[PDB]
Structure formats: C-alpha cells, structure tokens
Write a protein that binds this DNA or RNA. Structure first.
Ligand SMILES: [K+]
Lengths: 80, 120, 49, 46, 135, 178
RNA sequence: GGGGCGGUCGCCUCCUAAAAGGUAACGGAGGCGCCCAAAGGUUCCCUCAGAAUGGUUGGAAAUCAUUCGCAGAGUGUAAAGGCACAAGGGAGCUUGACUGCGAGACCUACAAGUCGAGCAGGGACGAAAGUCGGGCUUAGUGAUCCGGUGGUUCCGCAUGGA
RNA sequence: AGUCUUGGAGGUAGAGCACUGAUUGGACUAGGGGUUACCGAAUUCAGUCAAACUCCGAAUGCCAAUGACU
RNA sequence: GGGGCCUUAGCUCAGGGGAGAGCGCCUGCUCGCAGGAGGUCAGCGGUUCGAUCCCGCUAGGCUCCACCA
RNA sequence: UGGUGGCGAUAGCGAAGAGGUCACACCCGUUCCCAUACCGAACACGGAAGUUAAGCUCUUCAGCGCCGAUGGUAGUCGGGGGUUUCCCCCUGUGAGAGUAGGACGCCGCCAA
C-alpha cells in the first residue's frame, strides 16, 4: 500500500525573454522583450506595455544597452 | 541638535521628478527657471545637444530694479527671455518649473513668457 | 457579495455599461458619467434597477 | 495659523496672590495664580 | 548526533560530488587533521562514531574540531513499496565530503597520539583519508 | 516675547563667551518644543481623544494633531491607524510663550516639585520632560477634567552636546533638580 | 511502474530545466475560481523596516524627539521578477474600470490567449508638457447549442401588420 | 546552411557569502539562571554549506548583423 | 499499511479578539441564594495584528478499507 | 562663482583644513498671494540687520565603498583514455576568489 503526493501542479510556460536581436531591424510595434517587472528598461523609441512588455515605437535597428551601473535598456534607432 | 537638508537639495529631488517627463528638443526647448533668495533666472535649453539657446535674468542690465527677487521682477525676465528667444526662432517651449511650485514668481515668469510670444 | 451590474444612460436609456460593485459596501444605485455612444457625449449612467 | 481651529491667542496679565504681575501669552485675558515662581516654597528655598 | 535545527526544504535533490573540496582543505583550528581522498556522503552516525572514537583515545586531553556538518538531508521510501507516488519520507543527514576536505582537526595532544587518534577515526568512516598537519 | 528678548540680548552672548564659538551662527538656540500626550486608553473610549485634543489646545494655544497607531499590537489591544494620542509642535513666538509659562507658572504647581531632572537629555542637546498631571496648567478647569492625564514636553535645541543644551536651558531659567 | 482502492484532472508562481525559448515523471514547494467605487484615473507632495539615546501613565513592545539607517519595509492576495528620478506613503479633483478602432508584434496544431504606437469621438486631471482604454507585473475562469433581457434605418412565406 | 568577424539576450558549471536559510570554533557579553563566565542571545574575528541562496560568473548553445570564403 | 474522525476546567460542553457556562468541589445562606476551585485549549512549529478555534506535522483513541491472482 | 546638462562611487562616504564683497546660501519679516491632518518647520510671499557655523565651492588624505589587470587555478566546447556516484590526458577557451595597481572627477553649454 502507498500514500499520495500533494504537489504535481504547475503553470503553462509564458515565453518570456528577448523577441528581437541587437542590431536586428524591427517594424513599429514589434515586441522586443517580454518580462515580469522591468528587467530591461524602455529607452529611445520604446514603450513599456501593461505587462512590462517592450516594443518598438518606430521602425529601425534594435540595441540592448547598459543603462547606468546596474540596469539595462533597449532602444530602436532610426535607419539612415 | 537638529540637522536638516538644504532647500535646494529638496528642490533638486523635485526638479528631477519634473525632468523625468519634461525635456527640451530643438523644436520645443526647455524653459528652465532657477529662482534664488535674491534673483530669478531663465534659460531656454536644448537637452539632446545640451545647449542653452537663449537666456535672461535679473542680473541682465535691461532689468533695472532694486526689488529683484519679487513677482514684479519675474514678469520682466519672462518678457526678456521670450523676446530674446523670438530672435533665435523659438516659439514652442516646455516650461520646466524647476522643482518650485507653479505659483507666484515662477508662475509670473511663465505668464509673462506666454504673453510675450512663447507658446506653452 | 460582489455582483454584476448594468449602468444605463439616464438620458437615452441605452444599457451602456456592465461592471461590478460590492453591494454591502455600495448598497444604493451607483452612478457614473460615462460616454453614451447613442448621444455621443458624456452622460450620467445609473445602475439599472 | 489655519482659520477656525486655533484659540485666539492674546497677551494675558498673570496676577499672583503675592502681588507679582507678569505678561504671558494666553487664550484668557486674565489668569489668577495662587503660587508663582517667586512665592513657591521650592524656589524661595524656605 | 549533529543535525540541523531546521531546514528550508526537507526533501532535497541528491546531487553530485565532482571536484576537490571548495574550502576546508587546510588544517586551520587545531594542529593536525584527517584529509579526505575520495568523494562520499558522511552520515551523522559516521561522524559521531568517528568523533567518540578519536575522543576516547585522547582521554579528555585535547580538542577536536569536526569540520563537517550533516546539513543535507536524504530520503527513503518504505520497505517493499513499488516506485512512484511521490518522493520518500526523509531518513537521515549527510555531509557531502569531497577530496581535500579536512574532516576533523585535533589539538592539545602529541603527534604520536593525534596520529593514533585519527587512525581510530579513519576506520569508522567510509573513505580513504590521510593525516595532515598545519603549514 | 520676554524670553526671546532675553535670548538675543543676554543668553546668546553669554553662551558665545562660555563655549568660545567662532561665529554667532553656532550659538545654541531652542528650535522647537513638541508636547505629546499618549492616549492609549483611547482604545476604550474614542471621546477620550477629543478631550485630550481640547485640553492640549488650551495649554498650547494651538490645535494638536491626533496621533494614529503605526502598527497593530495585540498586547495593547491596538490596531494600526487607530487614534492613540495627541502631539503639537510649538515654534517661533508661541514656543517662547509656552516655555515662559511652563517655567514660571506650570512647573511650580507640580505637587512635591523637586525641580526637573538634569539627566533627561538625549546625548544630542534635546531635553525631554514628563508631566504627571495636566492640572498644573492654569488653562485647565479642574471640574471639566474627566480623568487626570500626563504629557511629555520635548525641547529641541541646536546644541550638539548635553552640556551646551543644559547651559542654554539653565540661562532660560529651567528649574533643574539640585 | 498490472488492475482495484487511495490520490489526481482547469488556471497561476517557483524549482527540477542542463545561463535563449521549450522540456517529462502518482518529481519538489505553494497559490486561484477573487478583492477594491478606491486598493481605479490624474495632479501635487513625500519616504520605509529596525535600532540607539531621552521620556508621567508606559512595560520588550502604544505615542513623541533626536541621530543612525539601500531598503534590513511596503507593494489587497501565492511565488517570482520588479519597484526608493518609486511601482511604496499622503492629499485635492475626478470616473479613461471610456465608445469606435488599430500599423505592427508575441504566443500558437486549431480554438483561444497577449502586447500595441497611433487615429477619431467625447471626457478627467494638469498652468502647460502631457498622462489616463482599471489595479507593479503574471491567476480570479468555461466553447457551442438552447433560453431570457435591453437596443435596432435588418427580414417578415399574396399584401399591411403580427 | 557551415565557418570566420562583430553585437546582443540569459544566471547554468564554477565560485562566493552581498541577501535568505543552514552551520563550526574563538573573542566579548545583553539577559536569564546558581554576586558569579553559572550558562548565555546579539555583537565581533576567523571557518563551513545550498535544486527552489547570489556581490559574481564561464565554456557552450541561442538570436542577429556585415562582408568574406564555401 | 492507507484513509476518515477525535482530543477544552473535577464532570458535561460553549467558544483570530485574548479560555466561558452548568453541575461537582470550596465561601456564608437556609431550594433557591453568594463568591471562589480549576485550563501546557493532546502536543509540535507557523500563518499573522492576536491562534482553542489558521495551516503543516507528531502523538494517541476510535472508524472504514488492506482486494485479484 | 552661479545655473543647467552628459558620463557605471575611478564621481561615493569619512576625515582634515581653506574661502565668500558680487554670486549661492543660512538668515530677518509675515501685511498680502499662498501654506501646515499642528506649526511661516516646509511651502509661499516680502526684506537685506550679519554670518561663513552649516549647504555650496576649492585643496589634502586611500580608513571604508568603488574600479581593476597579470599569472595561476576551477569550470568547460571539441577530441581521446580509464580502475567510471567519478577520474585522467590533448588543441582551444577561461572564471570567481586573491592581488599588482587605479582612483578623493571627467567632459559640455549659459550667465556674471
Ligand atoms: K511494476
């Protein structure tokens, strides 16, 4: 005879991380990073979505960038 | 022993909060205000380049009054900064209140600037 | 407990808005000034009786 | 001072039973005191 | 018997034992010590058996530093159950030892003694050791 | 105010000579006086706060703030946010008026008054005084008082040491225990 | 890890998970089936835990006051990731907890799910810049059929109605 | 598509103790017990350890870019 | 072994807000009176602003199962 | 010197001195705009009696905090071996800790 486990649960995966590469071109409205909290900050021509999502205000070239001592931001710069 | 921070240190914390949102472009530069115990100052600043495009103050010679550091002085600076800025070709600005409450001297400078050409 | 409600444009009568309140906290008919797209302007919209 | 919450602060004449009168800030115009600093047995040292 | 006053988690992963010891690879506190030469779990039972051992040889004469602690717990399933249906109840406590770990240390006593003390300990443990001194 | 004039004309020069201050700005002054009444019995009676606020209004000549609980403490039957006392801050003119009255009128009327403690400084030039009964103040009508209540009076100075502060308060006329 | 019996069945968070993402087991830990009319919006202002020293009740612990004090607090709630130019605390005015949508992305067998600048309508707050399509973020839910209610320039079995 | 070159996201291996737990010895003691080291929490010095610890942090793998060679 | 339920004063039972009521037993009073007696709320460690009343485990007592070759 | 920006505390903290006429402050008023769950504290609005004590500015300092090689070592891609809970070797890469050292600000614009 045997007992019974009280665990065995877990959520579905939520596919976080970076959705576009540094130096990759993006169209306006492209998601650049999915995240819980602000692991990465919104930089130039990037907004922060309601679930902290980072996305391109413009069309242009992605850059992840050192933001201060600690933090990291992402920018989209205009192609020229 | 009471120990207490300077009112400027307190203001710089408040000014930071203002500057979070508000910032000067070449198109729409930042009309910063520093007031002081004795004087009031105004610089139209372009933050992308980091350049004061135009400027005016109670230390300028056109403003000639003994009661510098009052509301009546601020209106005179607000005129001078605006008209000098019109020569440079500045129309739209953003008013950086500079950590000070939008009131009295600081407001008087802003109102005078609105009256005399600048758009905010 | 907390219940479903309808707000209705007190002008045109258009049942414009569902929402939720707590009834114990809010026992009397709540009202808000939310846009009626029949009238095409903000009106008072009151909880339906 | 906010209007309507502070008592009207006046100059008050404090009259002691020993004959000493001194001006103190008070909400009452006159204050009669049986024992002041000049006549209290503690302060007189007697 | 040493065991932790509490833990965060009662059931742990068993883990692995690659590499030499992270620290505890010198004699620090006492003069002399028993260095491990092989990876093993040391039980809390083994420690006490190796402690009392070396202890009683010295005759109250000298000081021991046990330089391991059974912090990691392990489990087992009951006898004669099939696989599956959750992870087994916790069982005992094991300090992971790697090669290099100086497991005990001795002071107060001569080398002659200390050697013989630690010899007696070595036999209780389930690894090869060697004697060491402080440098 | 009498004490304010005394401070400027007599006390400040005397302190400057005694402690040999480089500049007038270093001379210890009284910055603020805070009066405090802990109404922990307000847990039983909400109206006890209103009484204490009223009494303290008469004493200080200024409406106090109702102090509210910072955290829940079951040992005192206390919940966070509950009104539990009153605090007022006297500065400028009213501070000197209150201090003059305290020293000259209120402190004498203490029953078996032996003077105020020389040891109730905080190591940083602030002086704290515990009053047992509010009835020492002449503004308090004895008949209206439902219950006798003490209060804490903190005199905050710009002194860096207890010696400087003790001197300042002695020269103001604070009746220290012999 | 035969079946029975026991346990479990959807959703969320963490670990396992091998530094993108994904990843199993009757593997290891917990949450959810809400709550809030402000605990939402905006404007302005602010800084927390704890300790030391001093204090009538009053004590380790209520309330002051002082100094020290990257957070040792807080963030409606599990956990994680975040957060002190605060996302934490306070106050004023409010209802954007808007209607029509939506370039373009993410996720994904499908069905669904997620983010979104921007445009129009008409607003809130603000001097203005601007911010606002609920809440620090991620659970709080259930296809179709069928039936109820409200609205409706639609249809209405010869025609007008129904 | 491979490879080189360049950029980037990420927290594993290892390591570390800055946080959270666990934990050894000494120093020094609040305080509580038999005026006392009688025993002592914190503090402090050194020392261990961690799938659900991290002040750190690879190799690889991954996503791209620009040419080149294939 | 597994599940399910239980553990409160002498006795019987009430009951997240700081542990009650009756009876017995004691107080003085002669079918009611008048105040006491007595609790590790089985225990443990924890959730928290407080825990008998959370939650997880340990006792013990009952109860139901433990089959098919 | 003031205002106001850019740059990872190499910018910081501490300590020790130095400077103020102008400029910045503290400071001195609360009649009025405006103000405080209480206060002219702060915020405002006014003024310049005097003060560099503090903020601020400028010097010195490496006590803490920061930055930080080099070599080595762990780890490891690929390829091999063995006595295989693990271990060794080969080309390549290469930490963390430690430390040599660095560092008590660097670059704008405007006004006077
Ligand atoms: K089987």
């Amino acid at each position: 005879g045997v007992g019974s486990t009280k665990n065995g649960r877990d959520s579905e995966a939520k596919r976080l991380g970076a959705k576009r590469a540094d130096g990759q071109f993006v169209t306006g409205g492209s998601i650049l990073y999915r995240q819980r909290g602000t692991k990465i900050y919104p930089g130039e021509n990037v907004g922060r979505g309601g679930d902290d999502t980072l996305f391109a205000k413009i069309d242009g070239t992605v850059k992840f960038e050192r933001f201060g001592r600690d933090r990291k931001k992402v920018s989209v710069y205009p192609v020229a | 022993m009471i120990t207490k921070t300077s009112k400027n240190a307190a203001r710089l914390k408040r000014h930071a909060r203002v500057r979070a949102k508000l910032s000067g472009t070449a198109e729409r530069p930042r009309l910063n205000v520093f007031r002081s115990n004795k004087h009031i100052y105004a610089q139209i600043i372009d933050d992308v380049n980091g350049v004061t495009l135009a400027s005016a103050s109670t230390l300028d010679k056109d403003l000639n009054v003994e009661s510098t550091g009052d509301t009546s002085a601020a209106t005179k600076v607000g005129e001078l900064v605006a008209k000098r800025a019109a020569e440079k070709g500045i129309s739209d600005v953003v008013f950086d209140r500079g950590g000070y409450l939008y009131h009295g001297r600081v407001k008087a400078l802003a109102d005078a600037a609105r009256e005399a050409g600048l758009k905010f | 407990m907390r219940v479903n409600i309808t707000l209705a444009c007190t002008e045109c009568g258009e049942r414009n808005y569902i929402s939720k309140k707590n009834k114990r906290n809010n026992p009397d008919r709540v009202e808000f000034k939310k846009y009626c797209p029949r009238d095409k302007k903000s009106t008072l919209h009151r909880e339906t009786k | 001072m906010k209007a309507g919450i502070h008592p009207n602060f006046k100059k008050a004449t404090v009259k002691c039973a020993c004959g000493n009168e001194f001006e103190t800030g008070s909400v009452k115009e006159e204050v009669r005191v049986e024992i002041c600093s000049e006549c209290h047995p503690f302060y007189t040292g007697r | 018997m040493l065991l932790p006053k509490r833990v965060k988690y009662r059931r742990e992963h068993r883990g692995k034992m690659r590499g030499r010891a992270k620290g505890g690879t010198e004699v620090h506190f006492g003069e002399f010590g028993i260095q491990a030469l092989e990876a093993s779990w040391i039980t809390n039972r083994q420690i006490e058996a190796a402690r009392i051992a070396m202890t009683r040889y010295m005759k109250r004469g000298g000081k021991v530093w046990i330089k391991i602690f059974p912090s990691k717990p392990y489990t087992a399933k009951p006898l004669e159950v099939r696989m599956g249906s959750g992870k087994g109840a916790p069982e005992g406590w094991v300090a992971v030892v790697k090669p290099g770990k100086v497991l005990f240390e001795i002071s107060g006593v001569s080398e002659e003694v200390a050697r013989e003390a630690l010899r007696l300990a070595s036999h209780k443990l389930p690894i090869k050791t060697k004697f060491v001194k402080r440098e | 105010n009498r004490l304010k004039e005394k401070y400027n004309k007599e006390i400040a020069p005397a302190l400057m000579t005694k402690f040999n201050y480089d500049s007038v700005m270093q001379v210890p002054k009284i910055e603020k006086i805070v009066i405090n009444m802990g109404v922990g019995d307000a847990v039983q009676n909400a109206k006890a706060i209103d009484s204490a606020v009223e009494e303290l209004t008469f004493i200080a000549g200024q409406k106090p703030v109702v102090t509210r609980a910072k955290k829940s403490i079951a040992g005192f039957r206390l919940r966070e946010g509950m009104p539990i006392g009153a605090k007022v801050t006297l500065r400028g003119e009213r501070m000197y008026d209150f201090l003059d009255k305290l020293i000259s009128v209120s402190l004498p009327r203490v029953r078996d008054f032996r003077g105020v403690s020389k040891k109730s400084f905080d190591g940083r030039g602030n002086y704290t005084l515990g009053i047992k009964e509010q009835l020492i103040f002449p503004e308090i009508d004895y008949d209206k008082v439902t219950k006798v209540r003490g209060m804490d009076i903190v005199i905050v100075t710009t002194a860096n040491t207890d010696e400087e502060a003790r001197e300042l308060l002695t020269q103001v006329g604070m009746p220290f225990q012999k």
